[PDB]
Write a protein that binds this ligand. Structure first.
Ligand code: A1BQM
Ligand code: ZN
Length: 140
């Protein structure tokens, strides 16, 4: 589990969104596994606006932050899970790293800020849903 709190927005994995998230919905996209809801309190996270391909992510199944090299956001095939059938997920970046069911939501960050959140994994891989192209998170 995990979320990004930027301004008056909460960014979470769409497959882990709560009823309160759906009842205060700002934007959602199943193809990216992202959902954004509105919040009453202001958040402290800042979004990265860069082209970094190295950063650090939080892995809840190890209570550790790991440095990783990750691919550019692209369309990747993801195996069937209890949340989605086997399909192509867009704006996904892959890296070599530990991930397990429960690790979704952990933040990936670079020197410029938050890059994205854990969304996929398996066999020594971890995939992150990019959020750097969502410019509207920085305003309104
Ligand atoms: C990060 C962890 C949950 O990943 C795994 C780690 C080890 C084995 C499987 C997964 N599961 C996985 O890749 N998911 C399940 C949840 C929905 C994801 C999606 N965005 O389509 C796909
Ligand atoms: Zn950066």
């Amino acid at each position: 589990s995990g979320a990004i709190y930027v301004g008056n927005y909460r960014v979470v994995n769409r497959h882990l969104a709560t009823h309160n998230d759906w009842a205060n919905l700002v934007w959602e996209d199943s193809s990216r596994d992202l959902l954004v809801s509105s919040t009453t309190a202001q958040g402290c996270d800042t979004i990265a606006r860069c082209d970094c391909q190295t950063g650090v992510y939080y892995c809840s199944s190890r209570r550790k932050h790991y440095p990783v090299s990750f691919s550019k956001p692209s369309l990747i095939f993801v195996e069937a899970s209890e949340y989605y059938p086997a399909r192509y997920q867009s704006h996904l970046m892959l890296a070599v790293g530990h991930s397990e069911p429960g690790d979704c939501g952990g933040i990936l960050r670079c020197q410029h800020g938050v890059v994205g959140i854990v969304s996929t994994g398996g066999n020594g891989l971890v995939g992150f849903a990019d959020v750097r192209d969502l410019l509207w998170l920085d305003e309104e």
